């Protein structure tokens, strides 16, 4: 993958959360996520995908991943997806927007989904 | 997983797209996605996560998945994430919202991300 | 406005909420909103804007509006914006996506904003 | 309004856009928006709403507004809504997420809506 080495490793967002990811040659993303906020403790599995052959015109690298907020410690009955792009270079970043859906009754489904934005850096 | 058998199989959305997924006991989602719309042809790999131990109070099952829009046919330099819940029973559904990020230059990043909603059924 | 008469009047969404709007020649939207769900009672003021000279190529009419959830009865310390398009004809509709922001502390701002979708019809 | 004087005036976002707003005692927002980016020239009318009696517990002030991208110069057949909160004090800010809907045919409605985030400051 063009940015396999750029993406693989440890990232931190503006909340102080930790994203540990391995990028595969094929486009796979596998790792763990630890949230600094919310009803979450320790690491959660993540999986996702990235564009392993991005444009060479200075565009970012599209990618996304999911965490279901169940691990051996806690189950928040919810899942977050991040959708964004990796930008390489001196100050490498992953710029994302996210959707956090909680399981709800049908009556409460209108209030099931939070939306936000996270920026991940290497420091 | 509580809804491992409920989620596993073939789903169709309101656009006529086809989502083929296998749910693992652990919370894994793996499969293929074929979009009826957009700069897409044939099947794309997907991966995601679901809550393998949902609430028993009639709430849905939180889940999410990602497609990077690169396969052997086409590369749209973009990724979609769906975030939603599975609702079991006579008319089983997966109700989602999605974020579609395209790789962009920094100047164009304000117009990188589409948002929408898809409802998947078994027929 | 091209759709001034089409938009003006009473609309109902899938939750059973009631949207009463007047469209001005200039692009203004003014009216009241009554939510069937949530910490809301009676009517709330709304204001917004629409495209008073839409494309003639069968495209919808872009529009948006805001409700702050304060009236003489209740104050939820929150605001919803709907962004969407009006589609005229036998089954006229306003198809929207919405963002509902609650006032929060800085620590809680990551969970300030819900996202959803509403479809309004004339019946 | 509690933050009538705090909100009223000129704001700038991270793109270099200019938001000029007057907050009314009642909860009204009226002003003009000038985008630094996109198919936009000069000022566009905006209208919105804010919570005129926010919580006194250090929470932000919920607010929203709409611009339809039609003025005497250009018509992009689209509308943006910003949903967010005002945070007062030394470094006052309005933190928003936005939805930008373009008028589309029914076939293209899946790609009608962009989502992003803008932060406005007084300098």
Swiss-Prot record, chains A, B, C, D:
Molecular functions (GO terms): biotin binding
Chief place of localization: secreted
Span of the annotated motif Cell attachment site: 49-51
CC terms in the record's Gene Ontology section: extracellular region
Keyword set, alphabetical order: Biotin, Secreted, Signal
Binding site for biotin: 33, 44, 82, 98, 110
Keyword match Secreted: yes
Domain Avidin-like: 5-123
Localization: Secreted
Family, similarity comment: Belongs to the avidin/streptavidin family.
Subunit structure, interactors included: Homotetramer.
Physiological role: The biological function of streptavidin is not known. Forms a strong non-covalent specific complex with biotin (one molecule of biotin per subunit of streptavidin).
Name of the molecule in the record: Streptavidin
Annotated organism of origin: Streptomyces avidinii
Full-protein positions shown: 39 to 157 of 183
